[PDB]
């Protein structure tokens, strides 16, 4: 039990998320912003981002407003097939097992 909804995205630097937009920007079947939306939990607002000029930019912007956790952003990337997207977050998250 024990309810929990705070989010740990505030810690993530702008420069860190900035790169995430360049990755999702890739119109691939397993590397698109829309694909990440489903993994994270924004499939309902998928059409909304599609209308925006930068869906990938609106995703993180809309996902952050509703909390936004790094544990989900890192896992969602591995579930699809991202490598750099995970290195950008882990690079800022800490510096132990992997860095850069």
Curated annotation (Swiss-Prot):
The modification Phosphoserine is found at residue 93. Induction: By phorbol ester and TNF. Residues 7-93 form the Death domain. It comes from the Eukaryota. Generation of the NF-kappa-B p50 (Nuclear factor NF-kappa-B p50 subunit) transcription factor takes place both cotranslationally and post-translationally via non-mutually exclusive mechanisms. A cotranslational processing allows the production of both p50 and p105 (Nuclear factor NF-kappa-B p105 subunit) from a single NFKB1 mRNA. While translation occurs, the particular unfolded structure after the GRR repeat region acts as a substrate for the proteasome, promoting degradation of the C-terminus. Component of the NF-kappa-B p65-p50 complex. Homodimer; component of the NF-kappa-B p50-p50 complex. Component of the NF-kappa-B p105-p50 complex. Component of the NF-kappa-B p50-c-Rel complex. Component of a complex consisting of the NF-kappa-B p50-p50 homodimer and BCL3. Also interacts with MAP3K8. NF-kappa-B p50 subunit interacts with NCOA3 coactivator, which may coactivate NF-kappa-B dependent expression via its histone acetyltransferase activity. Interacts with TSC22D3; this interaction prevents nuclear translocation and DNA-binding. Interacts with SPAG9 and UNC5CL. The C-terminus of p105 might be involved in cytoplasmic retention, inhibition of DNA-binding, and transcription activation. Glycine-rich region (GRR) is a critical element in the generation of p50 (Nuclear factor NF-kappa-B p50 subunit) by acting as a proteasomal 'stop signal', which leads to limited proteasomal degradation of the C-terminus, while generating p50. NF-kappa-B is a pleiotropic transcription factor present in almost all cell types and is the endpoint of a series of signal transduction events that are initiated by a vast array of stimuli related to many biological processes such as inflammation, immunity, differentiation, cell growth, tumorigenesis and apoptosis. NF-kappa-B is a homo- or heterodimeric complex formed by the Rel-like domain-containing proteins RELA/p65, RELB, NFKB1/p105, NFKB1/p50, REL and NFKB2/p52 and the heterodimeric p65-p50 complex appears to be most abundant one. It is linked to Immunodeficiency, common variable, 12, with autoimmunity: A primary immunodeficiency characterized by hypogammaglobulinemia and recurrent bacterial infections. About half of patients develop autoimmune features, including cytopenia, as well as generalized inflammation and lymphoproliferation manifest as lymphadenopathy or hepatosplenomegaly. This is Nuclear factor NF-kappa-B p105 subunit.
